[PDB]
């Protein structure tokens, strides 16, 4: 089976991967209000639909993979036969797992992008060179994002141990197979805000902006890493499909 054979079969990994990249790019472009030469410079909000598109592509791709895997299996139904079946089962578990994990991480990514944009309504210029920040109102919004974080359930019978090493630090896994998003960075961000009505001079605000934006950047690295892992799974799937597709031709 060739790369184009895969595509004709409806499986094109470039699609979801490009979309996830576009969402990461949308995230990176987000920028808090600042002052350049005493001139208050508005920030950049985010297009939230970019994240919705990523999520639909991830779900779409998963369905396409399951379709192929299933038709490949049905037409392959001995040692070789048993081994291939045990591999097909593993392949399916990984398809459902990553799709689930990636969709949840995307919702999380989308929500942070939301506070990043909304929060800008509470940051304005006061004096000729002073910044007014309503930390309380922003703090409340970050707390909301924390409260409603998405939760992802792994497929039945999944090596919780292996997935823990796989997913990394940004995430955690329950013995019940529930993968959660670490609120570590959102907490640091929330704990950095000042009370409402706070007015900071340029230097002071820039200090906070640097730290805050630093955490935002950390969230982006987490997602980016996970995305790279997801895309590596898509590659592993294409290989599985190619091998068992050859086995089918060999056994015929």
Curated annotation (Swiss-Prot):
Its main location: secreted. It holds the Pfam family T3SS_TC. Keywords: Coiled coil, Secreted, Virulence. Belongs to the invasin protein D family. Human meliodoisis patients have detectable antibody response to BipD. However, BipD does not act as a protective antigen. The N-terminal domain is an intra-molecular chaperone that prevents premature oligomerization of the residues on the coiled-coil region that are involved in interactions with the needle and/or itself. The residues in the C-terminal domain probably form oligomeric structures at the tip of the needle that are responsible for the regulation of secretion of other effectors. This is Translocator protein BipD. It comes from Burkholderia pseudomallei (strain K96243). The lineage of its organism: Bacteria, Pseudomonadati, Pseudomonadota, Betaproteobacteria, Burkholderiales. The gene is bipD.
């Amino acid at each position: 089976m060739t790369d184009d054979d895969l595509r004709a079969a409806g499986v094109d990994r470039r699609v979801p991967e490009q979309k996830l990249g576009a969402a990461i790019d949308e995230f990176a472009s987000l920028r808090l209000p600042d002052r350049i030469d005493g001139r208050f410079v508005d920030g950049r909000r985010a297009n939230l639909t970019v994240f919705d598109d990523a999520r639909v592509a991830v779900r779409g791709h998963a369905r396409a993979q399951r379709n192929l895997l299933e038709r490949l299996e049905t037409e392959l139904l001995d040692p070789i036969l048993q081994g291939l079946v045990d591999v097909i089962g593993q392949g399916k578990s990984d398809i459902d797992a990553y799709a689930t994990i990636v969709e949840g991480l995307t919702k999380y990514f989308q929500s942070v992008a939301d506070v990043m944009s909304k929060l800008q309504d509470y940051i304005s210029a006061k004096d000729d060179k002073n910044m007014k920040i309503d930390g309380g109102k922003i703090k409340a919004l970050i707390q909301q994002v924390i409260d409603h974080l998405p939760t992802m359930q792994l497929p039945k019978g999944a090596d919780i141990a292996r997935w823990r090493k796989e997913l990394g630090d940004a995430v955690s896994i329950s013995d019940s197979g529930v993968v959660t998003i670490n609120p570590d960075k959102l907490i640091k961000m929330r704990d950095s805000l000042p009370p409402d009505g706070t007015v900071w001079d340029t230097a002071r605000y820039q200090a906070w902006n640097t730290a805050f934006s630093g955490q935002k950047d950390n969230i982006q690295n987490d997602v980016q890493t996970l995305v790279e892992k997801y895309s590596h799974q898509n590659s592993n799937f294409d290989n599985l499909v190619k091998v068992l597709s050859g086995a089918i031709s060999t056994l015929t």
